[PDB]
Write a protein that binds this ligand. Structure first.
Ligand code: 4CD
Length: 210
């Protein structure tokens, strides 16, 4: 079955702001998502140091970027610690961290949207370039789940039937019509070079044939 949840009020407000505010520097979404993957990878590594068996679900720690022009999706995949169903629901929409209103209060006055990451809500910058975001995740302690939202104040969670991931999180950006530049090899390379040069895990940019 599919479960539908309301975003907490302030998160809905943030998402609307991200979608409606004129802001040309959209590329920062990729930095924020790679940062999130890096943090998740840090966590499973940290845990594996005391209990190595937590890598039984996959020893390699990496980030893959996978453009698909036919589906018009950009997918960020990591083999980080992943999220349980509860982690998913609690951290991707139903609970507003302090940084949510702090950020929007920051946008009032001087701050610009590129600072979003500093408030711990950088995930939502995905809606700078995506009309719908799907998050597939698998944590050692739980089943594989799919989160999805086109904003508008709700998201869904369901058990995922797709290819099993072993462990980690996959963010699938269904790109807006006018944002297909982020499917281009040279454009993604440029952004990763500029914003994510010192990530401590291998980042592989997959290519497509003509
Ligand atoms: C950083 C972060 C913020 C909010 C919730 C969860 C996370 C990370 C740490 C614990 C598990 N995790 C994730 O599974 C994860 C999530 C998102 Cl949103 C992503 O883009 C990539 C990921 O690997």
């Amino acid at each position: 079955e599919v479960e539908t949840f309301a975003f907490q009020a302030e998160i809905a407000q943030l998402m609307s702001l991200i979608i409606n505010t004129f802001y040309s520097n959209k590329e920062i979404f990729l930095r924020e998502l790679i940062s999130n993957s890096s943090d998740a990878l840090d966590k499973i590594r940290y845990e594996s140091l005391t209990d190595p068996s937590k890598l039984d679900s996959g020893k390699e720690l990496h980030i893959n970027l996978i453009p698909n022009k036919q589906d018009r999706t950009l997918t960020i995949v990591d083999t980080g610690i992943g999220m349980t169903k509860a982690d998913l629901i609690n951290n991707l929409g139903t609970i507003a961290k302090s940084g949510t209103k702090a950020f929007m209060e920051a946008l009032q006055a001087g701050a610009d949207i590129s600072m979003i990451g500093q408030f711990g809500v950088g995930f939502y910058s995905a809606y700078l370039v995506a009309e719908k975001v799907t998050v597939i995740t698998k944590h050692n302690d739980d089943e594989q789940y799919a989160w999805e939202s086109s904003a508008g104040g709700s998201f869904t969670v369901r058990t995922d039937t797709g290819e099993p991931m072993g462990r980690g999180t996959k963010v699938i950006l269904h790109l807006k019509e006018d944002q297909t530049e982020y499917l281009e090899e040279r454009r993604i390379k440029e952004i990763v070079k500029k914003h994510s040069q010192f990530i401590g895990y291998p980042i592989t940019l997959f290519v497509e044939k003509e």
